[PDB]
């Protein structure tokens, strides 16, 4: 949509400025704490051979994008559910009210939540998300895919997250803030305004990852 189209242009503008080819790179000047994300994917499990893709958002809400194209999200209170059917029908309910048709999906989500809780590390554990609007909605996973080098996650708030498998580095791109958060190999988390990276530049690691990110957003837009 337009979130992705906006993000492609923001990336293209940075990359076209050749930011790792500044005489003096002042990456630190492109930092903006006001732009840190409200939400990102802190854990995920690909069980798409059988069920779907389960994930945890940094607020400890969990969701699943099931093989049948439905989506179920358990809020961080551990009771409140949001269910999205194939036709887009959206329902708000509780695990504790007793919806018979959803009990198998509920127990599947509880399985993912419990797996991720026992076994997986929380990405960005050290980071406080920025403050989000009082009446804003919790995002869900719109789309995802993997390449041989990363998993790409597209959230319904327009964010795109990219986890690089080999060195554990991660980007979180928000087209609304026009910002990227980079989590480096030593788990340092930095958030930059893309237009400032155009002004001040950045290192060859971040530059290289932003060029890859643009290729991923093109894949997103190609699937449509």
């Amino acid at each position: 949509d337009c979130h992705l189209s906006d993000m492609l242009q923001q990336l293209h503008s940075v990359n076209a400025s050749k930011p790792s080819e500044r005489g003096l790179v002042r990456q630190e000047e492109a930092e903006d704490p006001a732009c840190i994300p409200i939400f990102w994917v802190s854990k995920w499990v690909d069980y798409s051979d059988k069920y779907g893709l389960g994930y945890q958002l940094c607020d400890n809400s969990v969701g699943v994008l099931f093989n049948d194209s439905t989506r179920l999200i358990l809020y961080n209170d551990g009771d409140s559910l949001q269910y999205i059917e194939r036709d887009g029908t959206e329902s708000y309910l509780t695990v504790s009210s007793h919806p018979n048709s959803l009990m198998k999906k509920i127990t599947l989500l509880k399985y993912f939540r419990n797996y991720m809780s026992e076994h997986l590390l929380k990405a960005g554990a050290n980071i406080t998300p920025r403050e989000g609007d009082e009446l804003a909605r919790l995002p869900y996973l719109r789309t995802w895919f993997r390449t041989r080098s990363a998993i790409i996650l597209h959230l319904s708030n327009g964010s795109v997250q990219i986890n690089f498998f080999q060195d554990h580095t991660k980007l979180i791109l928000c087209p609304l803030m026009a910002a990227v958060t980079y989590i480096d190999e030593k788990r340092d988390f930095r958030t930059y305004r893309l237009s400032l990276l155009e002004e001040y530049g950045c290192c060859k690691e971040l530059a290289s990852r932003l060029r890859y990110a643009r290729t991923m957003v093109d894949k997103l837009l190609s699937s449509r």
Partner: peptide
């Protein structure tokens, strides 16, 4: 990979 780190 089949799950996160």
């Amino acid at each position: 990979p089949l799950h996160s780190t």
